[PDB]
């Protein structure tokens, strides 16, 4: 696409500059261009791709919720039209991310750290599509569940319970259960088991790894506090 003529290394450098400048749409476009070079992504590059799109979709989700709330209260065509405009843009970003994962990040990801990372992203972006779905909603939910489940299976076999990627996956899958799948009990069980198994493995970690794992464990605790 529009990044076809730029060097892969220059696209990564510019994605890091865009992050510093809080220019997340540019950051996402640079990372999309880097993925389209066809080479696999390093751990840092995967995180740049995920941070970029998370920030872009985050702004769209926050705007969609404000508009949906105004629309719900109002129930002319303007509020619905504008909510639809934002919704279509959000769907477009999710479709772009899912397209990058399917062409061909997941199929080339053999290591647990990369494969779980991508399958979790696949689960997350189908979850963002499910948040706005009313039509296909069931099928979108199934696609999110399937991706999260494959990621969970690999993570339980290949990573320790304190693995930051494994923890973040479990955190997100528990939120999918709570408010997308209408399975609050599954959500609470998953968050509790994940927290308890990580706590039991903290003794194996260095000071820095302990900081990384406990930060995510606190998010599981925050959710459990709100849910129980």
């Amino acid at each position: 696409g529009a990044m076809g003529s730029m060097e892969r290394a220059s696209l990564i450098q510019k994605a890091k500059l865009a992050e510093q400048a809080e220019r997340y749409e540019d950051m996402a476009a640079f990372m999309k261009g880097a993925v389209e070079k066809g080479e696999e992504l390093s751990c840092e590059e995967r995180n740049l791709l995920s941070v970029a799109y998370k920030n872009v979709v985050g702004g769209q989700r926050a705007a969609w919720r404000v508009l949906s709330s105004i629309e719900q209260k109002s129930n002319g065509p303007e509020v619905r039209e504008y909510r639809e405009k934002v919704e279509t843009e959000l769907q477009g970003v999710c479709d772009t991310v899912l397209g990058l994962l399917d062409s061909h990040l997941i199929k080339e990801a053999g290591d647990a750290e990369s494969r779980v990372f991508y399958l979790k992203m696949k689960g997350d972006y189908y979850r963002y599509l499910a948040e706005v779905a009313t039509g296909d909603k069931k099928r979108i939910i199934d696609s999110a569940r399937s991706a999260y489940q494959e990621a969970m299976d690999i993570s339980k076999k290949e990573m320790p319970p304190t693995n930051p990627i494994r923890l973040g996956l479990a955190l997100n899958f528990s939120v999918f259960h709570y408010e997308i799948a209408n399975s609050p009990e599954e959500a609470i069980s998953l968050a509790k088991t994940t927290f308890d198994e990580a706590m039991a493995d903290l003794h194996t970690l260095s000071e820095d790894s302990y900081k990384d794992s406990t930060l995510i464990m606190q998010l599981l605790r925050d959710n459990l506090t709100l849910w129980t």
């Binding site: 926050a62 939120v175 599981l220 959710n223 709100l226």
Partner: peptide, 12 residues
């Protein structure tokens, strides 16, 4: 809407 904690940037 009450948003629960998810991984990464709290961008919404």
């Amino acid at each position: 809407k009450l948003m629960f904690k998810t991984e990464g940037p709290d961008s919404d």
